[PDB]
């Protein structure tokens, strides 16, 4: 049975009054340094610092030059040469912006997606590898050190509709993506082809060659299934070698490609079987665009619902029914919680809402 308990210590509302779609704590900050998180919504990116007695301190507010931009996602990284933190943001315009979080200057941007970007993810070992997932049906892998487009995951056997989410596994050997076509697709990046494409993106030097960098066009995934959910799949994360994914059926499904005993690294691209291992049930979260999250150690799973409830499960409890923690509710938190983020040490859980409100829950 779960023992995790939390207390709501603070809340605030951003003055733009627009829905907040993204929230991320900076997990790159070193131990002892202040806990910082970013929020995204409207044409805004806002940074906050967490302090004692539930204090949420406003640090900087970025306002995009384009008033019609709607940010949907953000992700933290660091400059591998100077150790400086960096923040990537993207949304409806289909443009990735790399912002210096200390000054709020847009350092650089990446154009190429034919439509909106639904999610950004940085590789867990290499801070220069940025993955973007888009309404154009494709995923794109970028090397932000050399400003190159490494690979485009899409085409013949890629997604047939908007890609809503994606996740790298813990060691960054593979990606699972999902979207509106009801499918979950695996893309290995530790293949000889992709490891060489990544190495080539590092050798690319414009002041040494006049030819443009050639991106890989990966048309075929390493696994594909439409047998987990019967509707859009708007969130996917790895849980070790297993997968967590959700649709609108008020359940997060824990599953794995192949039969029960099949090794993730030995499944063939034509594998037609899937194994469901369990379901984390909840209520009132049957609307699209509702993200679940986990803490760094993958000991807690969190998901907000359409009426302001925040569900939490203890992932160290094998049966998902006994894994359920006490649901986090506040009588004033009544709008849809689009995304949550735990601090690196799991001591703080932040939730962001459709009414521009931010809620801080501290672990007891």
């Amino acid at each position: 049975k779960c023992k995790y308990s939390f207390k709501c210590v603070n809340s605030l509302k951003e003055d733009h009054n627009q829905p907040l779609f993204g929230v991320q704590f900076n997990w790159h900050s070193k131990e002892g340094d202040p806990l910082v998180f970013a929020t995204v919504g409207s044409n805004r990116v806002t940074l906050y610092e967490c302090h004692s007695q539930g204090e949420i301190r406003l640090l900087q507010s970025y306002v995009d030059a384009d008033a019609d931009e709607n940010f949907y996602t953000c992700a933290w990284t660091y400059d591998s040469n100077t150790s400086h933190p960096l923040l990537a943001v993207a949304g409806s315009r289909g443009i990735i912006r790399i912002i210096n979080p200390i000054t709020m200057q847009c350092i650089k941007h990446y154009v190429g997606h034919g439509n909106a970007i639904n999610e950004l993810k940085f590789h867990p070992r290499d801070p220069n590898l940025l993955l973007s997932v888009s309404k154009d049906h494709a995923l794109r892998l970028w090397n932000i050190q050399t400003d190159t487009l490494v690979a485009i995951f899409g085409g013949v056997e890629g997604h047939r509709d908007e890609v809503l989410s994606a996740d790298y596994d813990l060691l960054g050997e593979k990606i699972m993506s999902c979207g509106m076509d009801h499918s979950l697709k695996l893309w290995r990046i530790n293949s000889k082809r992709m490891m060489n494409a990544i190495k080539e993106s590092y050798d690319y030097n414009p002041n040494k060659t006049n030819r443009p960098f050639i991106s890989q066009k990966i048309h075929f995934p390493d696994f594909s299934t439409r047998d987990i959910h019967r509707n859009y799949v708007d969130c996917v994360r790895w849980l070790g070698d297993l997968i967590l994914s959700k649709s609108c059926e008020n359940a997060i499904v824990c599953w794995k490609p192949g039969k029960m005993e099949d090794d993730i690294d030995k499944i063939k691209p034509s594998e037609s079987n899937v194994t469901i291992l369990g379901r984390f049930d909840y209520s009132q979260c049957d609307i699209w665009y509702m993200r679940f999250s986990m803490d760094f150690w993958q000991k807690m799973l969190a998901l907000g619902n359409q009426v302001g409830k925040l569900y939490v499960w203890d992932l160290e409890v094998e049966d998902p029914h006994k894994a359920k923690c006490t649901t986090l509710t506040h009588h004033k938190c009544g709008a849809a919680i689009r995304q949550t983020s735990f601090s690196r040490d799991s001591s703080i859980l932040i939730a962001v809402c459709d009414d521009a409100s931010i809620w801080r829950w501290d672990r007891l």
């Binding site: 933190p85 200390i102 060691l171 070790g240 070698d241 094998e318």
Partner: peptide, 29 residues
């Protein structure tokens, strides 16, 4: 168990990431 085996993979792989993070000194925001 499938559970204990998967939990052990998560424990060892997050420990690898945690050690890589411990060696780093990223500037605060």
């Amino acid at each position: 168990s499938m559970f204990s085996s998967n939990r052990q993979k998560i424990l060892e792989r997050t420990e690898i990431l945690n050690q890589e993070w411990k060696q780093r000194r990223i500037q605060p925001v």
